[model samples]
Target: SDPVRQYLHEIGEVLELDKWAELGAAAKVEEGMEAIKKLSEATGLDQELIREVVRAKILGTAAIQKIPGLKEKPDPKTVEEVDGKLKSLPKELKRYLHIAREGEAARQHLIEANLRLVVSIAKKYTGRGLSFLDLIQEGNQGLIRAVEKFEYKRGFAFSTYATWWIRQAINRAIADQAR
Candidate 1:
């Protein structure tokens, strides 16, 4: 009996499966989609929309922080002052700043998309004493460091860079614990 085939056949139940819970799970998936999408825009950026409004979704973990603005989380009043400052900047600089918003949202999208690799790496590590979920916790840290440090100017695949971070973070975490 192939464990892989068994997973595909028996474990891969589809559509609000187990019948009763399927709807609940499907409901969570829609909620997950909205939260993942909310992760994409500024109004899309609040963490409360993540679970203060919804729950039993993903396991308990930190949502992305309420975003800080420019090196600070500007109050609406401060933003008005900042907006006033921006008005005085050259038009090219203003446009650059606006374009930069795309990157901020874009960063989270990449983080979400690239996340699967962490879990893929995650499957192999529990024998090291940490559970798969904790490996995910450690690897998520690595994924983020990769996100911050990756250079678009360099001609290289990000996954290659990210995988290294992911591998190192998980490897080091298990090592640190064993000591």
Candidate 2:
């Protein structure tokens, strides 16, 4: 798929932390990652405006957790923190809320992030005789499904994994198109 190749290249450009590689030469990969994380966090660079940026960073984050020379898995406590935060949500309240619930901000952020991911996925399938808008609608349905089933413990980027779900949804929608 030409679109899939394009998507991978674009994602690779965004994810390649060349500077981090340089830093890894100076210090341990883990130390370098910590330094970069702290600096980025302190600078508030992690504050997201568009969900695509979040998605891109997340896609690359898997590599960060698996630094070539590092022995330790990227901070077990950090993983636990993410898992605990997600688990804290009540099962019933986890769905879309009528009122702005406690984790609503995070949930909305996640939705926005997924929306951008859908666009990225939809672009790849654009020339497959499918209307772009129709592809987007299908991608949104996939995003919804992804949100419901996502497990934070996986340590993979949500966007990287979610793209498949979006593509599948679009394909299924195309298959079901009323003749």
Candidate 3:
């Protein structure tokens, strides 16, 4: 299993909330207020595991800068030269490429996790002179931005915070489309 998913599953087992239902419940108002409180109280499980997961993700990303032809400008007289050079790259260069690939895969997991939120918010703005798919595409941008800016320390649910950004993106797209 993916490290992040495995970590989440371990946490779920400890909290008995499976699939992070507590996080979703915490985003709502009333009715589940007590549940959220209980969830908060149970937040002190194992920070080291979480940190390891994050460190793995970060290390995957940080090594990407070391890749040849990525961070540094490549100078080749022809397309063949560039292709040939890439085809015969050093082992260290190949390793960096693999690291960048892993980093992107790790990021995609998080992006897909929040896609349901994008779809939910996108549904509310359909028939506003934009296709549902177009709205969804626009909303995804905001969702991406939200994910990039989100900090767990802010004490708000990711869904709650992303809702505003997703709406902003869809509405702005609609306005632009109307012009």
C-alpha RMSD by candidate, in order = 14.0, 16.5, 16.4
Give model 3's TM-score versus the native structure: 0.44
lDDT of 2 by residue, 1-179 (tens): 56534543433433222332322222332232333344334433432221223223343333222211112243445544543433345555333221222122233345444455576778887877777766776787786576545554444565665677877888888778643
Which model scores highest in TM-score? 1
The global C-alpha lDDT for each of the candidates, from Candidate 1 onward, is 0.51, 0.46, 0.48
CA error at residue 28 for candidate 3, angstroms: 25
Inter-residue clash pairs, candidate 1: 16-22, 69-72
**Relative to the unseen true structure, what is the C-alpha lDDT of residue 99 in candidate 1, on a scale of 0 to 100?**
35
Q: Which ten residues in a row have the lowest lDDT in candidate 3?
A: 63-72
Off by over 4 Å in 1: 1-94
How do the candidates rank by lDDT, highest first? Answer: 1, 3, 2
Q: State which candidate, 1 or 3, has the greater lDDT.
A: 1
Tens-place lDDT digits, model 1, residues 1-179: 85433423321232211322322323333444444344434333344332222222111232333111112233445444444443455544444433333344444445555556776787778888887667877887888788666655445666677889989888999999686
Q: Could you give candidate 3's per-residue lDDT for residues 1-179 as a string of tens digits?
A: 75434433432332222234423332221222222233223443233322233224443444222211112222323333433433355554444334433433444444445566666687888777987667767877887677556553345666677779888988998989575
